[PDB]
Design a protein around this motif. Structure first.
Motif, short mmCIF file in Angstrom:
data_model
loop_
_atom_site.label_atom_id
_atom_site.label_comp_id
_atom_site.label_asym_id
_atom_site.label_seq_id
_atom_site.Cartn_x
_atom_site.Cartn_y
_atom_site.Cartn_z
N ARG A 29 43.20 46.31 108.79
CA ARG A 29 43.01 45.81 109.48
C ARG A 29 44.15 46.96 110.43
NH1 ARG A 29 44.53 42.57 114.94
NH2 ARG A 29 46.51 41.80 113.71
N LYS A 31 46.64 47.22 114.47
CA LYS A 31 46.79 47.49 116.13
C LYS A 31 47.17 48.28 116.63
CE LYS A 31 49.26 43.15 117.22
NZ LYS A 31 49.55 41.81 117.72
N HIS A 92 38.84 45.16 116.90
CA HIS A 92 38.10 44.36 117.89
C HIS A 92 38.86 44.32 118.79
CE1 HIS A 92 36.17 42.81 114.54
NE2 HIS A 92 35.31 42.17 115.85
N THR A 95 42.17 41.73 120.56
CA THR A 95 42.66 42.53 119.36
C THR A 95 43.77 42.80 118.69
OG1 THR A 95 42.82 39.71 117.89
CG2 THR A 95 41.91 42.41 116.90
N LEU A 100 50.69 46.69 126.86
CA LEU A 100 51.79 45.54 127.25
C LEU A 100 52.22 45.78 129.38
CD1 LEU A 100 52.78 44.45 124.35
CD2 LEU A 100 50.84 44.00 125.65
N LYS A 102 53.86 44.87 131.70
CA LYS A 102 54.80 44.11 131.69
C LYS A 102 55.88 44.02 130.82
CE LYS A 102 52.50 40.27 133.83
NZ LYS A 102 51.60 38.89 133.75
N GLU A 103 56.05 45.11 130.12
CA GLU A 103 57.50 45.23 128.45
C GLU A 103 57.89 46.87 128.74
OE1 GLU A 103 55.41 41.30 126.08
OE2 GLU A 103 56.44 43.56 125.22
N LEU A 104 58.77 46.79 127.91
CA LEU A 104 59.16 47.72 127.88
C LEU A 104 60.12 47.91 126.64
CD1 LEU A 104 59.16 50.52 130.02
CD2 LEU A 104 60.91 48.96 131.15
N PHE A 117 47.68 45.83 108.75
CA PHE A 117 47.36 44.82 108.09
C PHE A 117 46.91 45.05 107.14
CE2 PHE A 117 48.58 44.33 112.55
CZ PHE A 117 49.50 42.69 112.65
N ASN A 120 44.73 39.98 103.90
CA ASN A 120 44.75 38.75 104.00
C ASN A 120 45.66 38.30 105.46
OD1 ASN A 120 44.06 38.79 101.19
ND2 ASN A 120 46.15 38.58 100.51
N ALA A 121 45.66 39.03 106.34
CA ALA A 121 45.81 38.82 107.30
C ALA A 121 47.91 39.48 107.08
CB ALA A 121 46.45 38.16 108.19
N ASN A 122 48.70 39.71 105.97
CA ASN A 122 49.79 40.39 106.28
C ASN A 122 49.56 41.78 106.65
OD1 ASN A 122 50.46 38.55 104.43
ND2 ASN A 122 49.23 39.00 102.75
N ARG B 29 61.49 36.00 132.43
CA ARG B 29 60.15 36.43 132.15
C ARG B 29 60.22 35.44 130.46
NH1 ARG B 29 55.03 38.60 129.20
NH2 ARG B 29 56.55 40.21 128.48
N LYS B 102 44.55 36.31 113.50
CA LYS B 102 44.47 36.60 113.25
C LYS B 102 45.52 37.70 111.99
CE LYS B 102 39.98 39.59 114.62
NZ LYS B 102 39.89 39.49 116.09
N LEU B 104 50.14 36.75 110.47
CA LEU B 104 50.27 35.95 110.10
C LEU B 104 51.85 35.96 110.24
CD1 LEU B 104 48.83 33.11 108.32
CD2 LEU B 104 48.78 34.63 106.42
N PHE B 117 63.04 37.72 128.27
CA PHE B 117 63.55 39.43 128.92
C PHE B 117 63.69 39.05 130.75
CE2 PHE B 117 59.36 39.61 126.82
CZ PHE B 117 58.84 40.71 126.09
N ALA B 121 62.35 43.93 133.12
CA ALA B 121 60.94 43.76 131.77
C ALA B 121 62.06 44.52 130.34
CB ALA B 121 60.20 44.92 131.84
#
Ligand SMILES: [Mg+2]
Ligand SMILES: [Mg+2]
Lengths: 145, 145
Positions: A29, A31, A92, A95, A100, A102-104, A117, A120-122, B29, B102, B104, B117, B121
């Protein structure tokens, strides 16, 4: 407009990191997380198209541009990403591709984090990139050197 | 069990941390991310209830349990969280309370990450917690001690 080129390269770099570290085979997976202006310049406005195709090992001189939107659509439709062109993995967007707004990230505004990943989601690895200038790339840890 | 009590305490510890590190005043935030088993008992199944009120310094051997769901609702409705009950700050679930089913955290399945934050931000502090046993709490870095 290094909102297209840079992110494509970042993805490409992440792909080699996966080989360099022998975590490509274990990877099930992926992200992506966008920050600051990359996140702000939203869904459908170049960067997601750029990153997905790059995660498929398209690369930004190599690649055909008319093909990029269709290909993003196939990826979302099928929920399959052809990592580095070798391996089909579940994908997906809800997911695996986050904006983001609002973030920096602290070094610079045009920030990205790539994560892989196992099944087993590690978490296998995490890598932050920035795109600056015309669209050159740098890692978090090389930023200051 | 440790799906309500534990997370409430964790939110509490975080509030103390903010105070202990002199970041409460700069904080504008806050974000919560749930993992493994904690993320899997979804929206409206205990843990969000528990965390939000805990972030308001309600604390679990002492809060009114009839009040938690109504209060969570107001927080969402108003989009205001009354941090440590000293300070109302903007709150948006879509953005600030995430159920990462999804994923861990590595030590144990009941993982949480709290983040604060400032108004620019900039991230002030992260803290990972876990809830274990009856609902005792521990930080990432104390887990193995
Ligand atoms: Mg689909
Ligand atoms: Mg609302």
């Amino acid at each position: 407009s290094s909102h297209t080129v840079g992110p494509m390269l970042a993805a490409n770099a992440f792909l080699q990191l996966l080989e360099q570290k022998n975590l490509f085979d274990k990877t099930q997976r992926v992200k992506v997380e966008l920050y600051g202006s990359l996140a702000l310049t939203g869904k459908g406005h170049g960067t997601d198209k750029a990153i997905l195709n790059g995660l498929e090992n398209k690369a930004p001189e190599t690649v055909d541009p008319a093909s990029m939107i269709p290909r993003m659509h196939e990826i979302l439709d099928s929920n399959l990403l052809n990592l580095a062109g070798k391996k089909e993995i579940p994908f997906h967007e809800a997911t695996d591709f986050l904006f983001l707004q609002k973030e920096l990230l602290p070094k610079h505004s045009n920030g990205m984090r790539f994560s892989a990943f196992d099944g087993n989601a590690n978490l296998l690895i995490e890598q932050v990139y920035y795109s600056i200038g015309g669209g050159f790339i740098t890692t978090e840890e090389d930023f200051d050197k």
